[PDB]
Design a protein around this ligand. Structure first.
Ligand SMILES: [Mg+2]
Ligand SMILES: [Mg+2]
Ligand SMILES: [Mg+2]
Ligand SMILES: [Mg+2]
Ligand SMILES: [Mg+2]
Ligand SMILES: [Mg+2]
Ligand SMILES: [Mg+2]
Ligand SMILES: [Mg+2]
Ligand SMILES: [Mg+2]
Ligand SMILES: [Mg+2]
Ligand SMILES: [Mg+2]
Ligand SMILES: [Mg+2]
Length: 231
RNA sequence: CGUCGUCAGCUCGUGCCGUGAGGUGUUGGGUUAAGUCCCGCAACGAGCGCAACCCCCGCCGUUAGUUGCCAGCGGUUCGG
């Protein structure tokens, strides 16, 4: 499922803004830039996917996290397809570590979904209409992919582990295994199942996350063909 | 009951940080009479206060017309 001209898409980046634990996954340093050994990226995509596979055919949830502008939209796409939860926007603190309390805020999300599905009163004072709606958009704005999550995931997939160290931390505290794509600005040992590739190119984020979803649906019940990529 | 003080404040739940007292939230940019609301944030909510809900005066309408009122008619001892 794997493809080999990811060279055509990503082969990493970043200058000496590195982390030296990532040494093992590195070929050489060219444009004043850390260049990732693709043959290692390979050994790993495999091992990661083997983990990814076993998780779909047992029907286990995956939490998708990425909020840097690059991976922002493409997680709303690729995760919706597998219908699995995500946070695209802001990563609220304690989403895993304080799940039951965070979630007590989705019942509020649902409660507005009902209360706005009419009527249950519109003789509620005018501003109160306007007020509650604003709240609705707000919840929707962060929680739109989170609600799908009704229990702690059996695993989580992250786009930037550094950028989302909080996430990685919360998972790790819970024993929730962490899969992530990650370039040289990151700490390897911190990831269980790892994709050493560029994490800032919309090209790259695209290849890696898509084939993930494609591998999810394929061993889940079905197969599908192409899904949206911004040119 | 006074008072600080009608001052915008004081907490809590769970999460997180710290060996610990404790921190965070409640800080931060803007805005407000105000922890008033906005945005941002390892926090997310909740409580008591703020506010609002009550009384008063200011505008109008309705329901009422005596012991209250008198615009027009009629008288009128000259006092609706
Ligand atoms: Mg990066
Ligand atoms: Mg606490
Ligand atoms: Mg200390
Ligand atoms: Mg502790
Ligand atoms: Mg405390
Ligand atoms: Mg305070
Ligand atoms: Mg404090
Ligand atoms: Mg301030
Ligand atoms: Mg005041
Ligand atoms: Mg308040
Ligand atoms: Mg705040
Ligand atoms: Mg009051």
């Amino acid at each position: 499922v794997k493809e080999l001209l990811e060279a055509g898409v990503h082969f990493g980046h970043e200058r000496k803004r590195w982390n030296p634990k990532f040494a093992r996954y590195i070929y050489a340093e060219r444009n004043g830039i850390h260049i990732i050994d693709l043959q290692k990226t390979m050994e790993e995509l495999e091992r990661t996917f083997r983990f990814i596979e076993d998780l779909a055919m047992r029907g286990g949830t995956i939490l998708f996290v990425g909020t840097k502008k690059q991976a922002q939209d493409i997680v709303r796409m690729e995760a919706e397809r597998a219908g699995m939860p995500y946070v695209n926007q802001r990563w609220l603190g304690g989403m895993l570590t304080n799940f039951k309390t965070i979630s007590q805020r989705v019942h509020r999300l649902e409660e507005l979904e009902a209360l706005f599905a009419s009527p249950e009163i519109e003789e509620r004072p005018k501003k109160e209409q306007v007020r509650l709606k604003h709240e609705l958009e707000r919840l929707q704005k962060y929680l739109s992919g989170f609600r799908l999550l009704k229990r702690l995931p059996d695993a989580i997939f992250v786009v930037d582990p550094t950028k989302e160290a909080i996430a990685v931390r919360e998972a790790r505290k819970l024993f929730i295994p962490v899969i992530a794509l990650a370039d040289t600005d990151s700490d390897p040992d911190l990831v269980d199942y790892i994709i050493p590739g560029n994490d800032d190119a919309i090209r790259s984020i695209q290849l890696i996350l898509s084939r993930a979803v494609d591998l999810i649906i394929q061993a889940r019940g079905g197969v599908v063909e192409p899904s949206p990529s911004y040119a």
